[PDB]
Structures are given as structure tokens and as C-alpha cells.
UniProtKB/TrEMBL annotation, chain A:
Residues 2-119 form the DNA polymerase III beta sliding clamp N-terminal domain. Belongs to the beta sliding clamp family. The keyword Hydrolase does not apply. NCBIfam families: dnan. This is Beta sliding clamp. One of its GO terms (cellular component) is DNA polymerase III complex. Forms a ring-shaped head-to-tail homodimer around DNA. It is found in: Cytoplasm.
């Protein structure tokens, strides 16, 4: 049976990384485990839910080569509560596992690694490099508008599109579209894939986000691979033709509004206090020369607010789900934003001067 | 109707203080409200649940005197989300309320203050002064061992006892006793009262906890009053004879253990990961120079050895790990003394300076 010695801090960092691929609630028991693979010359921790696989290398000494699967919850809680010293992990043929550190000892029962579905081999072709910061930020800037249900599988993921030195990240749920553009310093072959939402959410939790550290990405047909520090994230891709959205990014508008981003965000956020879970009231905007008036009313009461704007084009009254504006404005760093509208039934676009983003929000249909 | 102008920050600090006395659930609709009393020369915010009442003074301008009750949840959320400018509050005779700030305006409906149960007048006799730090810490050091049910009303509160310059704070739930002693620089008349657990929990949430800021306390028969900054907390007291506990603090023991507080705490905390949703005891095997701790469940087992200095008999004793965890988490000392007689008798956690006594009953496993 297996025998290893690891520093607690290295083992803790590792279990905390691979745990993001351990299913929250499942009927599959081996999926609730972390695999310890010490069969070769490296200590490898692994978690796989069949969609998302996470692998990490732990620094340590292999005294006796071996493999074991341990309950992810019990093993992480053990590692997290052990003293800050060397941790010994020892197993036997009956899968009885002893985890020892200083004068403390835990006896638990593991499972055979033969039941564990290993992360598949993925051929590494062309590599894409992004800073940890850029990847974490582009997910934060788009992840909120993926669908909250499984009615359409493609809507539960994010489109990743590369053409020459440009990357475009897209999410949509049928009510809005979030698009981010990134100019890269390298030229790459064209690629268009849909990454599951859960993959991007879980990778957000393990990527520190330094602007000085990089992520190497591989897109090989049915899989996406992310490498950073001593971790490998492998994810299945969503199959099918993604929505044709370039047709909807019609550059024609009848109204353009320049407004302070923080004032708009604070006002829409104020309005939401009047509408609670059992209510679904739109925020009404009345855009005139130099002014935007926002209203909401409910059983709790009403709100009226005026915001100074710079408006070009037609006066317009338009309604929206406040949540959609709050989600997009929360991820816009710019001091001011440009709102583009055609009419009260047409989409509204939040765009910037530098071409970094497009947030499309569908308004409320009042049916005239 | 009423008309007031207040800075948002002053109004926010005030609603955040009085909200701690707003009952989560009530039989009287009006008690879900915060009372704004601007009938005299001060702006007073007030909340009450019939047991605990909180009053606070807001700096501002009274343009038109008046009283209104506003839903505590809606009013606090409004104040918290308004811009950082002056907030105007205006009401009419139909209780329609306008809350305005900068270019934002809210229209809500209030209630008459005439339905509100005001904090009663409490005669201020002898005053007791404690730092905010001391009061916040003594509650943290004892509040965890009040009863989690209402089977016995006295067990849901904490005993507050004063004799000359000594204050003693006691909580018990039938399985353990937490006693804290505080030496004060003033001498006071004897007082023995039982303060509701909820009062102490709510006051911990509003006391900043500075060692340089003081709390003035008044104990007048049926009530306890706490005063700090621009806030007054009033609470009813629990009636009845508190448990005779001095009889149980028998100084006789057969085993004394000196152990590192952090080492014991970390070990008992490690053991708890093996008990989930299960109620298994932690078993201690105390011998010369060593304490062995064990726990066994369906998940697995743990064995741990801790270096100790032991005087007296070897002993094997079992406990609910939670009771040790709760007490050790509030002990600041590097080392603790454990005193025992036998596996069925209480265990005492004591310090050398007489600052505390934590009594824990063992589990007769
Ligand atoms: Cl791979
Ligand atoms: Cl507070």
C-alpha cells in the first residue's frame, strides 16, 4: 500500500484547488472523492465530475507508490485542521487509511482508484496565453448573464471566439447579451467554442488573478484545458452552433445617452428595495433633454429619481428589469457609459468608446 | 405633519442601532416599526419588543414637530441606499411619508405613533461603569452556555451579581456552567439580577467594544438600563430565585492538569470533524505527562497525545466536545488548569488569577 509525506500547507492548497470539481450534491459516490495518485514520481491530486476535471501536483516524498480515493469533505477537513507540520498518508490493501501529523492520527477508509474516472488525455496543439487577471476579469464581466436553467444547453455556457489577435467572450440568456473584447499581442488560428458556465465559475474560485502571472489555454475539439501554477483544469465543451448574434448588433439608434455609471447604478439599486421576491416590477426610464427620470412603484411604495444626462436624438420612455442593468453596471469600471436605443420595444446597448464591451438588454414589452 | 432634515450617516448609524430591538416576529404589527419621535427638541429613534427597547438621538433639524412609525425593514433599506447627503423626512395627517435626498424621493406610508409602546421611564439610582470592551468580552465569554430552549426561563438569561468591587456573570444550561469574575475600581451596593439572553446578544451587536469608551449601567428592580454614546438600551429582568451554584464550586479534586490551551482546543476541534448531523463523546486518558484523546464514529477514528503536567490520579473521562470547544474559544490564557474528581463528577477549567470558572459535566459513557 501507498505511503507519502507532504507539508500540510502544500496538501491544503492542493485539496482546496481540486475540491472545486467535486460535485456539491450527487447520487454518484466515487465522484464525492479526491484521488491521490502517487503511482509514478509525482504526487497528483485529482477530482473529476465527468464534465470538469482538476489536477494539481503536491510537493512531497513518495515512500511507497500507490493510489487511493478519499472522501473529499472528510479529507479536506482533516488536512485543514491538522497542525502545520509534515503529514503522512499511509494506506493498506483493505483501503484503511492513516493520516498522521505530529502527535495526531486519523483512521479513515478509502476507495480503490480503479473506480475513479481519470481526466482524459487532451492533445496540446496551439496555446493561448492570458494573464490570470484578464481571464478572471472577463469571466466576472460576462458570467452573470448565462441561463439560470437547462432549457437550452448552449445558453448555460459562454462562447469563446478567437480571430487573429482578438478574443471575444459572449453570454446570453434570452433577455440580454454580454460581450467582452480583448486585444491580444499574439496571432492565433480561428476558434469558436462554448465553455460550460460551471467550468468558468469554478475556475474563478481557484485563479488568484495576478496581472503578472499567466494562464495557458488549449482548445482541442471537444475539450478546453487551462494551465496555471501547478494546476490543470480540463473541461468538456458544449456541442452545437452558437446563436448568430452579429446580426443583432445593428449599429442604428434613435437615442444616445451619456450618463455617469455610478449614479445610474446607485439609483437602479435604490429602486430594487421596493420590489421583493414575490414582485416583478420594471424600472421606468423617461429620457428627455439633459435628464433621465427613473420610477418604480409597488405595494411597499414608490420612488422617483432624476439623473443629469447628455442626450442626443429622440425623447424616450422605456422599461426594464432592474436586475439586468445592475448586473452589467456592477462590472463596468468606466466613469461614464453610453446607452443606445431605437424604441421602447427594441434592445438597449451599453457600449464604450474603446470597443471593450457591449451589453445588450431587452426592455419590458408593455404591448403599447 | 412632521418635517426633519438629517445627515444620511447620522440617520444610518441610528437605524442600525435601534433595529436590534425590532422583533423578527411579533403579534403586534406596530412593533415591526421604528418610531421617529421629533415632538420635543430632539430627534429620537426608538424600537421596542416589550422585553428590550432601544432609543437613540439623531443630530438634525426639526422643521415641523411630529411623530411617525415606519416599517423598520423598509426605512433602514431606504436610509442605507440613499446618497450621502441630507435626508428630508416629511409626513402628512394621512401618514403618507416622503423621504428625499439629492434628486431621489421615496413615498411610503407610516403609522400613528399612538399605537406604539414607548420604553417605560426607569428611575436612575446607583450607576455601574464598565468599558465597552469589558462588557462585550464578558458576554462573549459566557453567552454560549445559556439554554437553547425555553423549558426554564432563568436558564435563558445570565446572572449579574455585584458585591463591593466584584462583578460575577453566570450562565448555565444544565450540562455546564460559565462564570466570569471582574474586579472593578468602584465599590457598589449588592445586586443580583438575571438579564435575558436576547438582551445581551443584541447589545453585543451595537457596542463597538473600545477599551477607552464606557457603558453606564442602572439596575432598578425590574429593569436594567445600558447607556453608551447617544444610545439607551432598556431591558426587563427575569423574575425568580437563580440556581444555588456556590455549593457546586467545591474546591476538592483528585486530578489537576496543566495543558496548553491552543493545543487542547485544536485537538478537540480536529475530533469534531468525525461527528456529523451523530453525537459521540471525546474520551480523555490522563496519565503522567500525557493526555490521550480519542473519538470513534462511522466516518473513522482519531487518536491524539498532548503533553501535560498532571498532579493526582490517572483518569479516563468522556465529554461532549462542543462544551470544551465553546469554553476554550473564549479563554485567552496560553495555559489552562483542569480539575477533576472522578469520571462521573464535574470538570473545572480555572485560571490562577480567579478570572473564570468553566464547569463541564462529563458524559457517563
Ligand atoms: Cl490533459
Ligand atoms: Cl451598529
Amino acid at each position: 500500500g501507498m505511503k507519502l509525506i507532504c507539508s500540510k500547507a502544500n496538501l491544503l492548497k492542493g485539496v482546496n484547488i481540486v475540491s472545486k470539481a467535486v460535485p456539491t450534491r450527487t447520487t454518484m459516490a466515487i465522484l464525492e472523492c479526491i484521488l491521490i495518485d502517487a503511482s509514478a514520481n509525482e504526487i497528483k491530486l485529482m477530482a473529476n465530475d465527468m464534465e470538469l476535471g482538476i489536477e494539481t501536483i503536491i510537493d512531497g516524498t513518495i515512500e511507497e507508490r500507490g493510489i487511493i480515493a478519499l472522501d473529499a469533505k472528510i479529507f479536506s477537513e482533516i488536512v485543514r485542521k491538522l497542525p502545520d507540520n509534515d503529514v503522512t498518508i499511509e494506506t493498506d490493501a483493505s483501503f484503511k487509511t492513516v493520516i498522521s501529523c505530529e502527535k495526531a492520527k486519523f483512521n479513515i477508509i478509502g476507495k480503490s482508484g480503479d473506480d475513479f474516472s481519470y481526466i482524459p488525455y487532451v492533445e496540446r496543439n496551439e496555446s493561448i496565453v492570458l494573464s490570470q487577471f484578464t481571464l478572471k476579469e472577463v469571466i466576472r464581466q460576462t458570467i452573470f448573464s448565462i441561463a439560470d436553467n437547462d432549457n437550452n444547453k448552449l445558453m448555460t455556457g459562454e462562447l469563446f471566439e478567437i480571430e487573429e489577435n482578438k478574443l471575444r467572450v459572449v453570454s446570453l440568456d434570452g433577455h440580454r447579451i454580454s460581450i467582452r473584447y480583448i486585444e491580444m499581442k499574439n496571432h492565433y488560428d480561428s476558434k469558436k467554442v462554448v465553455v460550460p458556465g460551471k467550468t468558468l465559475q469554478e475556475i474563478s474560485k481557484i485563479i488568484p488573478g495576478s496581472a503578472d502571472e499567466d494562464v495557458v489555454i488549449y482548445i482541442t475539439n471537444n475539450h478546453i484545458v487551462f494551465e496555471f501554477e501547478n494546476t490543470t483544469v480540463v473541461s468538456r465543451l458544449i456541442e452545437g452552433e452558437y446563436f448568430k448574434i452579429d446580426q443583432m448588433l445593428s449599429s442604428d439608434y434613435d437615442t444616445k445617452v451619456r450618463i455617469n455609471k455610478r449614479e445610474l447604478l446607485d439609483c437602479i439599486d435604490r429602486a430594487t428595495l421596493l420590489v421583493k421576491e414575490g414582485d416583478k416590477k420594471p424600472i421606468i426610464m423617461n429620457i428627455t433633454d439633459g435628464n433621465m427620470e427613473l420610477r418604480i412603484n409597488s405595494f411597499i411604495g414608490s420612488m422617483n429619481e432624476d439623473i443629469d444626462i447628455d442626450k442626443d436624438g429622440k425623447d424616450i420612455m422605456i422599461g426594464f428589469n432592474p436586475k439586468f442593468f445592475i448586473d452589467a453596471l456592477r462590472v463596468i469600471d468606466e466613469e461614464e457609459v453610453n446607452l443606445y436605443m431605437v424604441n421602447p420595444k427594441a434592445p438597449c446597448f451599453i457600449k464604450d468608446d474603446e470597443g471593450k464591451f457591449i451589453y445588450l438588454i431587452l426592455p419590458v414589452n408593455f404591448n403599447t
